[PDB]
Amino acid sequence: PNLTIVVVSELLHTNWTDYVCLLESRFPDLQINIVSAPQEDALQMLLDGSAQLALMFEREHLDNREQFVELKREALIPVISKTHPLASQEHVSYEQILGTRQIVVASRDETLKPELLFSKHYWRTDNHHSACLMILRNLGWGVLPQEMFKENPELNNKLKALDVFDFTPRFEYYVDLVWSRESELGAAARFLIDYIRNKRMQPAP
């Protein structure tokens, strides 16, 4: 038997590893395959049974074919390379961001969210590691998961948060654990879902 979990691309550089450790401790002979896909493909994988669980960040596309349980919120920060021309400057004006290249993460142009584009020109990539590498080369600025800074403490030396966004709503993902309602859940999947639901604190009666 095996358990395949699809982590939507945008959530790769997030915190899913705790769930894998839980599963591995409880099922020491289980084969756990961690794969990644656009959210659109992730959902189809749940429908045709190639994945048993998905980590996703948007309920908008969810029909009732899907069931889910809320997980943690993941924080993202707008950053720029400290050696970028705009970085010498004490602060980046909102005109300067309007005129600088933004590196955006999205599965395709179609899935680009306009309220999150702040520059007139942008490049699109489908994962935060690619975005991060290009920002590091001074090719632009963009929004990265705070977790990346935990994974790689040298990034603080090389990247700088953009203060100009301090009076703007924070960038974040709300992460759900999603499965197919029609599926017959395996023991490991049921263990994890039950674990997450049971660990939530409920109001006193």
Distance, CA of 88 to chain centre: 30
Interacting span for a copy of itself (CB under 8 A) from 68-76, 115-123, 170-178, 183-191: 115-123
With CB under 8 A as the contact rule, which of the stretches 32-40, 68-76, 161-169, 175-183 interacts with a copy of itself? 32-40
What region, left, alpha or beta, does residue 71 occupy, with left being phi > 0 and alpha being psi -120 to 50 degrees? Answer: beta
Task: Tell me the residue number closest to Br ion, measured at CB.
Answer: 27
Segment near a copy of itself (CB under 8 A), from 68-76, 82-90, 121-129, 174-182? 121-129
CA distances from 172 to 109, 114, 163 (A): 20, 15, 17
Q: Which does 96 bind (CB under 5 to 8 A by kind): Br ion, a copy of itself, none?
A: none
Strands (E) in 62-170, as ranges, are 66-81, 102-105, 122-125, 141-145, 159-161
Taking CB under 8 A as the binding criterion, the range among 25-33, 62-70, 184-192, 195-203 that sits at the site for a copy of itself is: 25-33
Residues 5-64 that bind Br ion (CB under 5 A): 27, 29-30
Residue keyed to tokens 């963009």:
142
185 contact choice in Br ion, a copy of itself, none (CB below 5 to 8 Å, kind-dependent): none
Select the binding partner of residue 125 from a copy of itself, Br ion, none (C-beta < 5 to 8 A, by kind). a copy of itself
Token pair belonging to 136: 């590091």
Q: Compute the distance between CA of residue 36 and CA of residue 131 in angstroms, rounded to an integer.
A: 16
Q: Which of 13, 81, 97, 159 binds a copy of itself (CB under 8 A)?
A: 13
Q: Which two tokens stand for residue 116?
A: 């999150």
b/e burial code for range 71-88 (CB count within 10 A of at least 16 → b): beebebbbbbbeebebbe
56 lies in the site for a copy of itself, by CB under 8 A: no
- Distance in Å, CB of 57 to a copy of itself, minimum: 17
Q: Which listed option, a copy of itself, Br ion, none, makes contact with residue 161 (CB within 5 to 8 Å by class)?
A: none
Residues in touch with a copy of itself (CB under 8 A): 7, 12-13, 17, 20-21, 24, 29, 31-36, 121-127, 129-130, 133-134, 136-137, 139, 151-154
Residues in touch with Br ion (CB under 5 A): 27, 29-30, 91-92, 104-105, 143, 162-164
